């Protein structure tokens, strides 16, 4: 509490309102100037990059960015404009410009104009509260720009100034004698929600009359398109409601018109809720400590975190298949010279994971900040006499250990289940022998087709149920190995691994057929013989989301489901009967019998072709029905996978793993039960320890629990990233086209570890992304310097280094070096910067898994 600690804590709560208000208004104005520049960065003369690409789908949907507009403009407004001083537009003049460049420049300028003015008006409230300020204090870096000192004594934002430099003439909100103004923060909740309702109404008027998207049901009967004037329902997506990439009319609320009708809906709701609160503001005793801005800061901030998580979820679904993003896949997208696989989905993934990441940070930081309010209360005596039940509901220390311990138990059980299943199935997929057990892989041999006429040597047991049976090789009467055709494989049969070409399982010798004539519920339309070893395909159904999704889809699609089932049925019967006819040919034994047989097969054949084409086309019609929750790349149903089931369990376990430190902040900011047995009392929110006593105590403060939340949460977050970008999370080594994935029509990019090496071969083909990869790795491992129990070693070595450098200064007569003292971070600041370095390392590196492309092929 003397070093660097007073720099990132210089602006703490509570604060006066004019100071919060003006500072927010200035940030708003600054964020509008930055978006201004992003509009300039989106014009059509620039390369694709990750900024202008995250904005383009939305700019298309608004009609600002026209995808099919090539005509160059040469005059538009004021007379004669080939190019000027910076030219016809400042510096945009050497370029050829279209209408969408002008729209983009118009919107960019507005943003910059309205931003700059919001910055000024915000400084009028901010500096105006203080009576006013000087150009030299506002800007502060003008003292050392000699000359300009006569215009750095001028006072701005003053109370009685001439109009153009006034600030707040009555000094503060509370003194100004306007009765409309509300005097507390509860009271003010009402005009705030009226103001927000009005911002909605503004966006809908702009949508309707400036962007020309009327609200449903007042949509136009026709729209203008690059091919002329077209009925709304046939005009393609940016212009009308017809989705080209799915080839269907869009629901009316799936369009930007749907969005302008919701503008008016939401606006009316917010205005009415504000009118209600104008007569009935919040009042209960449970809430009146929230007038302190330090306390509401906790409520608001972790609320916004939850809002951010909810944006991620809603946005993901709503837009995973929307024509805004798919339209990027036809725009010849080139980044750092390259050509991207599926840039639509990539950009979509980046926006949703960016919201996800904001959600975690703000929830955690809101809780941390709340822990600071509560520690304050304890350390001044008034925690024990808080009156709101939102504090007092959790004061009993024994309830606090019951809450925490059962959320540890729930975390434990569900993480053990998830991770334990991942481990079981990587054992299965890798065919590992443990001596005590042999893991066995999925393997499939087609049994219909022409592949069902391929022969195999088969070792057949007689009676698996008599231990001490044994088996024999299937043979001819002549003694030589009979080749069994795949159609005649039976359950129990063993085939040599090396007759199948398998070199990856050298520890066991045979594949066992465990199921014949198998057709995947969801998968390829074929019939198979299977070794299910240890691979647990049933685990897909251990997912409550498998069942809700499939039940609702069955209900919407019941009678094509039913006909597809009857087609499969008729086909399996035809296959079986055709296999018996083929077998009578094989074993016919005398050409009279062999002609009779071949003539029977020749007569059944047309009918077996009919049943196959029937099954094929019902199974194709079934696989093109609309998705509910689990989706294709073309918004079609897919069954849930082992991957989806693992992701369900990992969300429960891993978010509880990551959030148990936050419950420790909320309950144990002053005393945990380990502290309370010793009589200890944590004296501040950020102390590093108090140890070596009792074995050592590093990491009990609230600041540290915040850092341990951030780390532990890296684990569910990376589950989310792998799952968005198409990794397979249910094992560690899944290969892209392994027999299981191929037979069950699953597309994935890798499998835990394998994903990592699989995506990085794509990452290596971009030299900007490989530079990012190198820098990312270096930031991270340096966090270890700062996080290991080693600060004393670093202090005592730094000291040797300082002595030495001062010896060199004194010897060589170099005055700048005879008093060097190297600065060595203390333990608290080492933990802060260690968490910073750990976090940023990891998440630059994750950006790369998204930036490489979306390789899921659906």
């Amino acid at each position: 509490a003397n070093g660097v600690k007073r720099w990132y804590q210089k602006l703490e709560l509570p604060m006066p309102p004019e100071r919060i208000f003006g500072a927010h208004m200035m940030l708003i104005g600054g964020l509008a100037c930055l978006i201004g520049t992003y509009f300039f960065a989106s014009m059509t003369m620039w390369n694709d990059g990750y900024v202008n690409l995250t904005l383009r789908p939305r700019l298309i949907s608004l009609g600002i960015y026209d995808p099919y507009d090539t005509e160059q403009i040469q005059r538009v407004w004021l007379p004669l404009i080939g190019e000027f001083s910076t030219s016809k537009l400042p510096f945009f003049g050497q370029y050829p410009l279209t209408m969408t460049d002008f729209r983009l420049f118009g919107w960019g300028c507005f943003h910059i104009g309205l931003g700059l003015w919001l910055v000024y008006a915000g400084a009028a409230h901010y500096y105006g509260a203080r009576g006013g300020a000087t150009i030299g204090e506002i800007f502060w870096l003008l003292p050392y720009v000699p000359g300009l000192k006569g215009l750095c004594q001028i006072k701005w934002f003053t109370p009685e100034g001439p109009w153009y430099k006034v600030g707040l003439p009555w000094g503060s909100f509370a003194n100004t004698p306007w009765p409309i103004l509300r005097r507390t923060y509860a009271d003010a909740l009402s005009p705030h929600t009226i103001y927000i309702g009005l911002l909605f109404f503004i966006w809908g008027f702009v949508l309707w009359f400036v962007l020309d998207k009327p609200p449903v049901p007042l949509q136009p009967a026709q729209v203008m398109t690059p091919n002329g004037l077209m009925p709304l329902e046939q005009a393609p997506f940016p212009y009308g409601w017809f989705d080209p990439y799915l080839n269907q009319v869009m629901h009316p609320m799936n369009t930007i018109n749907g969005e302008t009708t919701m503008c008016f809906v939401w606006g009316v709701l917010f205005v009415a809720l504000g009118a209600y609160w104008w007569y009935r503001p919040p009042r209960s005793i449970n809430i009146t400590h929230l007038e302190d801005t330090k306390a509401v800061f906790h409520v608001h901030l972790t609320a916004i975190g939850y809002v951010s998580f909810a944006l991620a979820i809603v946005g993901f679904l709503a837009l995973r298949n929307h024509p805004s993003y798919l339209m990027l896949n036809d725009m010849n997208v080139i980044i750092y010279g390259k050509k991207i696989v599926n840039p639509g989905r990539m950009i979509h993934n980046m926006i949703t994971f960016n919201h996800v990441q904001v959600g975690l940070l703000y929830v955690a930081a809101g809780v941390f900040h709340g822990g600071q309010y509560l520690h304050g209360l304890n350390i001044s005596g008034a925690y024990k006499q808080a009156r709101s039940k939102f504090i007092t509901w959790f004061q009993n220390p024994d309830l606090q250990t019951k809450i925490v311990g059962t959320t540890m138990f729930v975390s434990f059980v569900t993480v053990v289940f998830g991770y334990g299943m991942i481990c079981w199935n990587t054992g299965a997929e890798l065919d590992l022998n443990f001596g005590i057990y042999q893991f066995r892989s999925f393997r499939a041999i087609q049994m219909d087709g022409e592949a069902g006429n391929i022969g195999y040597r088969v070792f057949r047991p007689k009676n698996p149920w008599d231990p001490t049976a044994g088996g024999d090789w299937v043979k001819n009467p002549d003694g030589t190995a009979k080749l069994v055709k795949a159609r005649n494989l039976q359950v129990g049969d063993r085939i040599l691994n090396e007759e199948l070409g398998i070199g990856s399982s050298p520890t066991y010798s045979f594949t066992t057929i465990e199921e014949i004539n198998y057709k995947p519920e969801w998968g390829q339309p074929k019939l198979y013989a299977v070794q299910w070893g240890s691979w647990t395909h049933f685990l897909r159904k251990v997912n409550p989301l498998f069942w809700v999704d499939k039940g609702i889809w069955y209900l919407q699609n019941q009678k094509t489901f039913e006909a597809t089932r009857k087609a499969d049925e008729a086909y399996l019967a035809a296959h079986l009967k055709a296999v018996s006819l083929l077998n009578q040919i094989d074993d016919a034994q005398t050409e009279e019998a062999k002609q009779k047989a071949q003539a029977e097969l020749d007569k059944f054949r047309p009918e077996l072709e009919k049943a196959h084409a029937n099954m094929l086309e019902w199974n194709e019609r079934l696989a093109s029905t609309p998705a509910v929750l689990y989706s294709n790349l073309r918004d079609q149903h897919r069954d849930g996978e082992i991957n989806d089931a693992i992701f369900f369990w990992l969300m429960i376990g891993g978010w509880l793993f990551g959030f148990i430190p936050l419950l420790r902040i909320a309950f144990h900011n002053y005393q945990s039960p380990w502290y309370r047995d010793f009589e200890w009392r944590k004296q501040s929110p950020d102390f590093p320890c108090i140890g070596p006593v009792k074995g050592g105590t590093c990491g009990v403060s609230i600041q540290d629990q915040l850092w341990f939340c951030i780390l532990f949460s890296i684990k569910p977050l990376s589950a989310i990233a792998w799952y968005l970008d198409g990794g397979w999370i249910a094992t560690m080594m899944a290969r892209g086209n392994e027999a299981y994935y191929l037979t069950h029509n699953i597309s994935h990019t890798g499998g835990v570890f394998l994903y990592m090496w699989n995506e990085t071969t794509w990452i290596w083909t971009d030299n900007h992304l490989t530079a990012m990869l190198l820098l990312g790795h270096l930031i991270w491992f340096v966090s270890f310097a700062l996080w290991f129990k080693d600060r004393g070693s670093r202090a005592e070595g730094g000291d040797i280094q300082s002595r030495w450098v001062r010896l060199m200064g004194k010897r060589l007569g170099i005055k700048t070096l005879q008093e060097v003292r190297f600065p060595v971070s203390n333990l608290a600041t080492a933990k802060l910067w260690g968490t910073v370095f750990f976090y940023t390392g990891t998440f630059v590196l994750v950006f790369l898994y998204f930036a490489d492309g979306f390789f899921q092929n659906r």
């Binding site: 390369n47 099919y68 370029y95 036809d330």
Partner: protein, 145 residues
């Protein structure tokens, strides 16, 4: 603040035709594929009778220049429609197995470098942006199965 925009540079495109942005054309599928079809066919003849006079003559000037550098058109090895020639081993772009087992990024370098014996290198004939357009046109030849 940081990305004040983002300084990514200006986009490389093809040749300019007066009054119609070439940079823009290079991201608008119907414009880029019209130029890909011209390169692919070696003529402006299969272009929509709706094509403007200026367009039809800019393409011809493009071809005439390429004819002096001994450029060989893609059609007629591969045909006007795909799926080349088994005789010459010329690739069939209509085939779905050929299409699934190629990425568009990968396809690029096989046109740049040429491919084994007969398919010629185009690195000294065409710009990398004109190869990108052709990879996009070849994509639209795919048939099912």
């Amino acid at each position: 603040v940081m990305a004040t925009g983002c300084f990514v540079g200006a986009r490389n495109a093809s040749e300019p035709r007066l009054g119609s942005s070439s940079i823009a054309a290079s991201r608008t599928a119907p414009a880029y594929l019209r130029e890909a079809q011209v390169l692919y066919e070696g003529s402006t003849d299969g272009l929509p009778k709706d094509t403007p006079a200026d367009e039809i003559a800019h393409y011809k000037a493009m071809l005439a220049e390429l004819q002096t550098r001994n450029y060989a058109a893609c059609a007629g090895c591969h045909q006007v429609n795909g799926g080349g020639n088994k005789a010459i081993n010329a690739t069939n772009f209509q085939d779905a197995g050929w299409q699934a087992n190629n990425s568009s990024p990968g396809m690029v370098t096989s046109i740049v470098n040429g491919k084994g014996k007969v398919m010629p290198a185009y690195k000294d004939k065409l710009t990398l942006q004109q190869i990108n357009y052709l990879v996009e046109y070849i994509r639209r030849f795919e048939k099912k199965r």
